[PDB]
Design a protein around this ligand. Sequence first.
Ligand SMILES: Nc1nc2c(ncn2[C@@H]2O[C@H](COP(=O)(O)OP(=O)(O)O)[C@@H](O)[C@H]2O)c(=O)[nH]1
Ligand SMILES: Cc1cc2nc(CO)[nH]c2cc1C
Ligand SMILES: [Mg+2]
Length: 170
Amino acid sequence: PQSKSRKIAILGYRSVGKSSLTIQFVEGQFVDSYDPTIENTFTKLITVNGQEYHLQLVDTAGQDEYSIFPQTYSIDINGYILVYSVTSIKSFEVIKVIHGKLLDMVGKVQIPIMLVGNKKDLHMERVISYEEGKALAESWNAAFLESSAKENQTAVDVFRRIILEAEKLE
Ligand SMILES: Nc1nc2c(ncn2[C@@H]2O[C@H](COP(=O)(O)OP(=O)(O)O)[C@@H](O)[C@H]2O)c(=O)[nH]1
Ligand SMILES: Cc1cc2nc(CO)[nH]c2cc1C
Ligand SMILES: [Mg+2]
């Protein structure tokens, strides 16, 4: 087809950089601040392996270990990006809980789930190694990338990759 519309939900604990990553990709800017309590859907046209997509990104407000994941929430979602911050242990423990709840929601439907460790630019504050995030992702059979919302190419790589994974499963 000439174009495919795909919707990806961006999940994770408060403050890990879900809005900033999404805005870096969509607008090519690192925003000073963006309301942490707001959920918006952003869109961007991207081409992956010659195929054009209208990618819709649902920048969720945030989840924690008491968040819920009714099957209702999964309607029209084609893939999930689970974000933690490499500077926050809490955020990494939370993404593990979110993933298990997510799996319960989506069951065995063929939709991609990838893991993203964000804020990789904060070297002095890092508390999670690359390898710890990669091993988690492997245990999930999930793609893994680290990012910085201050680095446009790392934002682009994240959203290109979730579309590549979606295509492999379709
Ligand atoms: N240094 C750095 N700060 C980041 C990065 N991503 C987000 N931030 C900052 O982290 C805070 C939370 O970011 P936000 O995008 O609002 O997180 P959200 O709650 O997941 O949407 C804000 O002060 C952002 O400026 C990143 O990759 N590097
Ligand atoms: C697509 C989606 C959006 C959500 N928003 C919240 C509350 O921030 N939880 C969510 C779960 C899903 C799957
Ligand atoms: Mg936000």
